[PDB]
Structure 1
């Protein structure tokens, strides 16, 4: 089966808490004997706090998954740490934090069109990769993207901080979900494409919450009714057309992520 890379606990030097959740705890840390270059490098370390029996089993399958789910625009997974007490995963560190915060902090030094396209294109690139791996994310949103140096952007999936972005039972990011996911919890590459359209809207509104005006009930009604977010002020019409292509009511009518990437990448290269 899949051999997950193991990192010695003693090679991890914890530096600072980045965050906490009901389930996880994330640290910034230095890791020795990892880099091919440097002596030590920065990493992000997630330690599970007193996990269930299923949680343990879940952790191991996720580690095996992440071992090969590897791409320039997917947050880098390095391996698991220690020997289970507790369960620790080690990821690269992305020094500019989550994209939603980043967006809101550069909104009315501002992001120009070329920067917003570069951001969007990188995310679509990661999604092209995910689709090639039959991987359905289910919670694509800028809060789950991270930003590194030079506006490098990568997709993760993080376990609180954005509770408002989920609806009560497990939490669903309804504002990012298409009608068939809300109704049937049918998640596919096509519902991720729908989510990406909303990511585009987030980027071009500097990280505003979709349907901020509406209640969760009203959002369900809204999406089901086939209503869509309006074009953001600084969103070029072709980019909005891409958004609408993501928001086709019938999943098989949606643009595929390869088409979306091809368009956004060209536009970003041209501007």
Structure 2
């Protein structure tokens, strides 16, 4: 497909936010983008002297996010022309990634209410419903890969492993998010919408533990063994039983027995005492 062309001259970098395997990410301002063409805050990923592989990944990402359009998938504005560095422009989400957001409101850090936690979960579920409808398998769903904006707006993204020390990925070739993966994904590399559902169950666990790492008490070896042997994450004390039952529904060993994300979204909606009303006016 065609990707929107953004002129390099229209982008002004403000602050470096971090770096993954695909280049540095910046807080920036962009002109001639808004309907009023006045400058607006954006997020920019810059890829310096990209390899052939990096270039193809850049292109795959640009085409994918052009086609993937939804309220709870990270918004993509476009790319600059060919050159060095390669530049990709995103919607700016001012509260950063969801894992740090959760930890910032946690006891170890005011707090998040049940309604707020369910709203976060429901938004992610909504994004996943869209992904499933597009037959897209994410394979790395986790709160670290979600962004938070104004009014607790949450969207699904994919940043990959940090270029900053992390314990979320393990070399089982490729670095894998084993703590978020079902048995069949770890053992047989089977990635489906059903394995994404498993990962959502773990996301639920993240939310109600304020961003704590799944299986924090286990080494990577112990995690693989544990998931293989069919053990599941324990119910957080502040987690309602109905929410934990949703987690258990995501964690059926047989993938076809797991709740589908459409069912999960309906349940989470029904669980809320006063779930937010969505408007487009």
TM-score, with structure 1 as normaliser: 0.96
TM-score, with structure 2 as normaliser: 0.92
Name stretches of at least 5 consecutive residues in structure 1 with no aligned partner. Answer: none
Tell me how far 1:186 sits from its aligned partner. Answer: 1.0
What are the Cα deviations for residues 154-181 of structure 1, in whole angstroms up to 9, with x where unaligned? Answer: 111003x462001022210000000010
Task: Verify the 8 A CA contact 2:20 2:159 in the aligned structure 1.
Answer: no
Tell me how far 1:57 sits from its aligned partner. Answer: 2.0
What is the alpha-carbon distance in structure 2 between the residues aligned to residue 136 and residue 162 of structure 1? 26
Identify the residue that residue 219 of structure 1 maps to in structure 2: 223
Q: Segments of 4+ in structure 1 off by > 6 A?
A: none
Count of matched residue pairs: 268
Task: Verify the 8 A CA contact 2:202 2:214 in the aligned structure 1.
Answer: yes
What are the Cα deviations for residues 97-143 of structure 1, in whole angstroms up to 9, with x where unaligned? Answer: 11000000101100010000000000000000111111111110000
Name stretches of at least 5 consecutive residues in structure 2 with no aligned partner. Answer: 276-281
- CA pair 196-162 structure 1, distance change in 2 beyond 3 A: farther
Tell me how far 1:268 sits from its aligned partner. Answer: 2.5
Task: Verify the 8 A CA contact 1:211 1:229 in the aligned structure 2.
Answer: yes
What is the alpha-carbon distance in structure 2 between the residues aligned to residue 25 and residue 37 of structure 1? 28
Task: Verify the 8 A CA contact 1:114 1:268 in the aligned structure 2.
Answer: yes
What is the alpha-carbon distance in structure 2 between the residues aligned to residue 237 and residue 165 of structure 1? 27
RMSD: 1.3
Q: Which moved more, 1:12-21 or 1:81-90?
A: 81-90
Tell me how far 1:37 sits from its aligned partner. Answer: 4.0
- CA pair 44-269 structure 1, distance change in 2 beyond 3 A: farther
Helix, strand or coil for the counterpart of 2:117? helix
Identify the residue that residue 170 of structure 1 maps to in structure 2: 174
What is the alpha-carbon distance in structure 2 between the residues aligned to residue 18 and residue 222 of structure 1? 35
Task: Verify the 8 A CA contact 2:250 2:259 in the aligned structure 1.
Answer: yes
Task: Verify the 8 A CA contact 2:79 2:88 in the aligned structure 1.
Answer: yes
What is the alpha-carbon distance in structure 2 between the residues aligned to residue 246 and residue 220 of structure 1? 18
What is the alpha-carbon distance in structure 1 between the residues aligned to residue 57 and residue 101 of structure 2? 31
Q: Which moved more, 1:161-170 or 1:9-18?
A: 161-170
Task: Verify the 8 A CA contact 1:121 1:268 in the aligned structure 2.
Answer: no
Helix, strand or coil for the counterpart of 1:75? coil
Identify the residue that residue 189 of structure 1 maps to in structure 2: 193
Tell me how far 1:269 sits from its aligned partner. Answer: 5.2
Tell me how far 1:212 sits from its aligned partner. Answer: 0.4
Tell me how far 1:54 sits from its aligned partner. Answer: 2.2
